[PDB]
Write a protein that binds this ligand. Structure first.
Ligand SMILES: [Zn+2]
Ligand SMILES: [Zn+2]
Ligand SMILES: [Zn+2]
Lengths: 140, 140, 140
């Protein structure tokens, strides 16, 4: 098991811009503050999105397009280093009433989004290709 | 994009009272401690609830009543200032097995609820009417 | 209402081992570090899992087995003391696309899992049998 230790100090609440990508805005914020490791959470609504699941056998993602407004029922994830820059790994649950979709988040157009960011001060984990899963998991 | 910066220090785990409203109990706690900004998370189960989704075009909420015991599969949100008092904005996923419902949380009767409250020390965001969404979003 | 106060300081991001139980790995980590109270969060995917819901009348859990790879759409919980050792209480949402399952988490074989652990420094809550719900809730 890989263990990454950190200290917490700052906290951020963000109001994302309407009509822009959710993931892209967070990453822009991260770059601006120089945050390389963090825990992410959010709620709100999106105008559309692109999610997907990971085929654990073929070792590839399978995405789904959703071109309908949905509530961000749940949004959670983390920040780490990939290709020399802060990289967001986020999972979500979008929908309304009994209509629920979930998976790895690729993109989402924001309607109204409030994001909580908890930066983690310490060695930022780096994502490297992992043979076993076919994903880019933390190494050191 | 609006950015609100804070420092973290305290942490709270609460055991809510059976038969009382989930949102109301948290709000009472916040008033007592004078918490104006925070991140919220909870798990447990409820005896009933009122959730809803936001029609992004008509600009109004559409609620759903659930008068059946449900598990709190996911509860996340934040605290901010609205009408000069701590205001909770929470989204949830309630249900059992494959029966899942989700949305903006209005009310929930508690069965057993464990809440994690992470107060945020800094300028609390205030909610003001936003023309674009018809929602009450953070101004400053 | 019961209130447990804490101070936050450290933060941990863990990369769980493939093919091992999710809950057990976190618990081994908590024991090694001596964490008696904390907030938990995670995302990733599992190869199989066992969840369930609580019948609030009969006062007993009803389990559900899932022997199919699933994405961890949402994983949230807390750590506390039970039987004199760190005990995890976790709720999850597993699935893909519109196939979503949710409930109290009993076990899950890890495919790839990134866990965020926020230890809470203070008097750790202890779980004791509660007549009203039939669950083991926090006392003091
Ligand atoms: Zn993922
Ligand atoms: Zn909402
Ligand atoms: Zn539970």
């Amino acid at each position: 098991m890989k263990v990454f230790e950190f200290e917490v100090g700052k906290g951020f609440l963000l109001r994302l811009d309407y009509g822009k990508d959710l993931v892209r805005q967070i990453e822009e914020f991260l770059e601006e503050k120089g945050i390389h490791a963090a825990h992410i959470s959010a709620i709100g609504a999106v105008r559309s999105a692109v999610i997907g699941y990971y085929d654990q056998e073929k070792k590839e993602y399978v995405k789904k397009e959703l071109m309908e407004p949905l509530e961000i029922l749940s949004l959670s994830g983390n920040v780490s280093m990939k290709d020399s820059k802060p990289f967001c790994h986020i999972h979500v649950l979008l929908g309304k009433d009994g209509e629920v979709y979930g998976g790895h988040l690729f993109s989402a157009e924001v309607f109204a989004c409030e994001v909580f960011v908890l930066p983690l001060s310490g060695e930022a984990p780096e994502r490297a290709f992992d043979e076993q899963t076919g994903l880019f998991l933390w190494l050191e």
